[PDB]
Structure 1
Amino acid sequence: LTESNKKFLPFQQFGRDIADTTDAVRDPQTLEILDITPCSFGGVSVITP
């Protein structure tokens, strides 16, 4: 949950993108807009001499 710099209109709760993925949410207590980001993924690569 990263502190975003974009404000939300005072009738919305969620936020999506072009790919229809919910990456923006609003905390229901003191009106903070927090982004949603995938944690971590990848693959281990081995370099052999």
Structure 2
Amino acid sequence: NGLTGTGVLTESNKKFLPFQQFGRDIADTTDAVRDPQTLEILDITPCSFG
């Protein structure tokens, strides 16, 4: 929905309140999203590097 980024998406158990769309924790780092169609919470983690 216009919020773009690279990572890997898995299932998540966080309970969004019915009007948010995504969440962040510290320093504006998105961690969870809600898909616009199925309306479920997905968790984003970065692709591995080193």
Give the structure-2-normalised TM-score.
Answer: 0.72
5+ residue gaps in structure 2?
Answer: 1-8
Structure 1, residues 6-48: CA drift from partner, whole Å, max 9, x if none? Answer: 111110001001232001100011111001110110xxxxxxx
| Root-mean-square deviation over aligned CA pairs | 0.9
> Greater RCO between the two (CA within 8 Å, min separation 6)?
2
The structure in which a higher percent of residues are strand is 2
Give the structure-1-normalised TM-score.
Answer: 0.74
5+ residue gaps in structure 1?
Answer: 42-49
Using the aligned pairs only, state the percent identity. Answer: 100
2:37 aligned residue:
29
Q: Runs ≥4 in structure 1, deviation > 6 angstroms?
A: none
